Amino acid sequence: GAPATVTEQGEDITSKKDRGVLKIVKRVGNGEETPMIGDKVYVHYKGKLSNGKKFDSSHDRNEPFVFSLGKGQVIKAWDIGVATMKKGEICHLLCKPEYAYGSAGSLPKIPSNATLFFEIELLDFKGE
Ligand SMILES: [Cl-]
Ligand code: NA
Ligand code: NA
């Protein structure tokens, strides 16, 4: 399925080239511009654990998730991966724990040492 495909066929987007964050573009977005550090970014997402359980979805809440890019407000895989996206793009990201919640995990649903799969849509980005 999609997690296996990104694991085996995804592109390493890390600057370290350590395969910690792998990406596949699923829906090509608009234009060429990617968001800037500090921009307000608006995303829809769904996350799954490696055991197949869905742990989060903004679609289910009927509102996007909003954060300032490149500020550590989200897991490192999201700062790195959203910075590569175009407006309107949908991608899959596979996130090793070193780019996610590490040995701590995150209650209630994310265990220690968890590799995470996301589908992310970049809805919009705005500076000031
Ligand atoms: Cl799938
Ligand atoms: Na596929
Ligand atoms: Na892109």
Residue 40 alpha carbon to ligand 1 centre in Å: 30
Residue 49 alpha carbon to ligand 1 centre in Å: 12
Experimental technique, in short, is: X-ray
Quickly list DSSP for 17-74: -SSSEEEEEEE--SSS--PPTT-EEEEEEEEEETTS-EEEESGGGTS-EEEETTSSSS
Q: Which ligand is nearest to the CA of 26?
A: 2
Spell out the domains of the chain, with CATH numbers in brackets.
1-128 (3.10.50.40)
Query: Distances in Å between the alpha carbon of 125 and those of 80, 83, 98, 122?
Result: 15, 10, 26, 8
Cα distance between residue 62 and residue 58, in whole Å: 7
Q: Give the catalytic positions in this structure.
A: 45, 55-56, 75, 101, 118
**In Å, what resolution does this model reach?**
1.2
Residue 91 alpha carbon to ligand 3 centre in Å: 8
